[PDB]
Design a binder for this molecule. Structure first.
Ligand SMILES: CCOP(=O)(OCC)C(=Cc1cc(C(C)(C)C)c(O)c(C(C)(C)C)c1)P(=O)(OCC)OCC
Lengths: 15, 278
């Protein structure tokens, strides 16, 4: 749910 | 001296800092610039107080040598007090991306669960940003020198003790006066980043343990590089400042939300970092 609510952050952390 | 492991920890931190901190802000561009009921009233009144003592003038030095200077409006009707927020939002967002990159290259950070990385960044974004800003803060002129951009505090009647009132401003002067090394700043960023008590962390145990390692490293670095009795309690002073910064972070974040509530302006990344639905 946390990742779901933070897609930008999630994307930036996976590149 | 420092243990080999401590030496490696510092090196990884410095590597991260050099790879992700654009100290000349040469890559910051395309940003915005200021153009050229009872309950509601209560909200505005608080918002005016949230930024009336955090005013700065802005200076832009063009390549050709020309200079644009912007002086903010005096607190009048209302709207005008938000004139610089869009710009500030762009600058801070730029800084935050740099902070996220910093964390990403740190092995200790990568091994953490993705949900924890997110939680740690949300909790420390403002802190790491202000720690980096302190390195470009000129205490003599009360100005943050960011490459072609400069943000100067608007001195008032009081002056020093006047500004000393705002916790974050007093923080910058105090921290600058300690004349810390790049290594100490980067270790401060690590201790702040790996705070086990950020709301939402699951791997409390692992994070707490990592923070302590970083703290012991900083304490040791100080013991080895500055034995002078004058630095006897430097480490404790730094740890005390970090605890304060954490309180300041919570307070400014609340300020952000209050402003956002009556005048939405946060960028998409800021909305995620500070819990804004928008
Ligand atoms: C939660 C988000 O915080 P925030 O990143 O948002 C910026 C748009 C934020 C960043 C910030 C804060 C300060 C103070 C606090 C030292 C005065 C600055 O001087 C600067 C500059 C860029 C000019 C060096 C930036 P805020 O303190 O700036 C206040 C003027 O705003 C906090 C809501």
């Amino acid at each position: 749910s946390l990742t779901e609510r933070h897609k930008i952050l999630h994307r930036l952390l996976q590149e | 001296g420092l243990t080999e492991e401590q030496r490696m920890m510092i090196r990884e931190l410095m590597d991260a800092q050099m790879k992700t901190f654009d100290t000349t802000f040469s890559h910051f561009k395309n940003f915005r610039l200021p153009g050229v009921s009872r309950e509601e009233a209560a909200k505005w009144s608080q918002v005016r107080k949230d930024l009336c003592s955090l005013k700065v003038s802005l200076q832009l030095r063009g390549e050709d040598g020309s200079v644009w200077n912007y002086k903010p409006p005096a607190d009048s009707g209302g709207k005008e007090i938000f004139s610089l927020l869009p710009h500030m939002a762009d600058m801070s967002t730029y800084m935050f991306k740099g902070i996220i990159s910093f964390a990403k290259v740190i092995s200790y950070f990568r091994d953490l669960p993705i949900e924890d990385q997110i939680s740690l960044l949300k909790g420390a974004a403002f802190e790491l940003c202000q720690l980096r800003f302190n390195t470009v803060f000129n205490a003599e002129t009360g100005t943050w020198e960011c490459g072609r951009l400069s943000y100067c505090l608007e001195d008032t009647a009081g002056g020093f003790q006047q500004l000393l009132l705002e916790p974050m401003l007093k923080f910058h002067y105090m921290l600058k006066k300690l004349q810390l090394h790049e290594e100490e700043y980067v270790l401060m960023q690590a201790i702040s980043l790996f705070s086990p008590d950020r709301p939402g962390v699951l791997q409390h145990r692992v994070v707490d343990q990592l923070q302590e390692q970083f703290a012991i490293t900083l304490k040791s670095y100080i013991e080895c590089n500055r034995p002078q009795p004058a630095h006897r309690f430097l480490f404790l002073k730094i740890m005390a400042m970090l605890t304060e910064l954490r309180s300041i972070n919570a307070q400014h974040t609340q300020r952000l939300l209050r402003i956002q509530d009556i005048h939405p302006f946060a960028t998409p990344l800021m909305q995620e970092l500070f819990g804004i639905t928008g």
